[model samples]
Target: GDDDEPGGKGAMYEVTIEQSGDFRSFIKSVVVVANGTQLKDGATGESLASPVILSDEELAVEKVTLSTTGKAIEFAVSGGVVDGEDGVVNEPMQWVVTVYKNGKEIEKKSLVFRDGKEISTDDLNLYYN
Candidate 1:
């Protein structure tokens, strides 16, 4: 598989999902893959990490890098949400993104989860050169 291609080329973006409410969970790691339309996997709710809690104002930014090849890849953030106990943090959440090239910072942004439901996005501030 010498020429089959390895990993992914182009650029990568960084993102963070924060709990706007309250909850708790352990997010091992995070990634930004291409979002699918099917119910099997939503864009913003996909979790590269195992579990984590969301507390009111309890913020956890799952930093990830996205590929920017053959067009700007559209994607979102997600994590395994485990119910936290009393005083535990787990609730509403939002995501933000940061793009980089050659280890240089390019852009940054914050995303909002409306109605506290499944994550979906037709448009994102992410772009590539």
Candidate 2:
């Protein structure tokens, strides 16, 4: 299974997601996509083809790593919403994305999420090198 070779080299990185604030069951699902590809869930390790569900409780942490190889990567995130007792909140969830090379952090960033509305950010492209 180690045959099919054509120069062995690729780009890889890890992404982390954290939940905070007065978060509740208002969040129906959270989807994370990178390079037009939906990533898998850190906890379940399942493909993010479907929205990641959440309970009334907040999420401590979640993560997903890049599987495919690429230099310039595009990442995006979208979430579903539901009106609940807590109304709308800002920075309810935090997205911590880091690009690592040779086990070293080359670049990292912390992004905030307000409500469950769809949102996308390419701020993590600084480490595309």
Candidate 3:
């Protein structure tokens, strides 16, 4: 059932996501997927438990990566950043991104969380070429 075309993850590279801080309690979960697998620890590593309940734990994720072929990461925030309570909302997490091409560094930027690109509530896209 190989019903597909070209330009599928044709050319890929390394995409890294590192936390500026813990962003603790703000992020309920950080979802990173690769080839249908959901990575854990925010992309720094993989989740050992199978079909684990992704709640009850927050994500810091020292690093995580993905190709252009698949969807990038997403951050689930608990209780939008409209409250002046607990300092959980309005974290202003300035996540850092290091993109590589052929083992060569291409760009280093803020991947947009709160005080950054504001990439749609933490949803990210590589949009590589």
Q: For each candidate, how many residue pairs have backbone atoms clashing (under 3 Å)?
A: 23, 1, 3
Instruction: In model 1, state the lDDT of residue 85.
Output: 57
State the displacement of the C-alpha of residue 58, model 1, in Å, after optimal TM-score superposition.
24
Residue 86 of candidate 1: its Cα lDDT? 41
How high is the CA lDDT of each candidate model?
A: 0.39, 0.46, 0.44
The residue-by-residue lDDT of candidate 1 on 1-129, one tens digit each, is 467656544334443333343222433234344332111123454443312323434335333333332222344333333334544334544545454544476556565543455766523433333
Q: In candidate 1, how many clashes are counted?
A: 23
Give the number of the best model, judged by TM-score.
3
For model 3, the run of ten residues with the poorest summed lDDT: 75-84
Candidate 3, 1-129: lDDT as tens digits:
989777544233445656655455453443323333343443334444222334324354444564333232322212222222465456556567676654588666663455545244543344442
Q: Local error of candidate 1 at 1, Å?
A: 38
Q: Candidate 1: how large is its RMSD? A: 12.0
Q: Give the CA lDDT, 0 to 100, for residue 115 in model 2.
A: 45
Q: What is the lDDT of candidate 2?
A: 0.46
User: Candidate 1's error at 125, in angstroms?
Assistant: 3.5
Ranking of candidates on TM-score, top first: 3, 2, 1
Which model, 1 or 2, shows the larger TM-score? 2
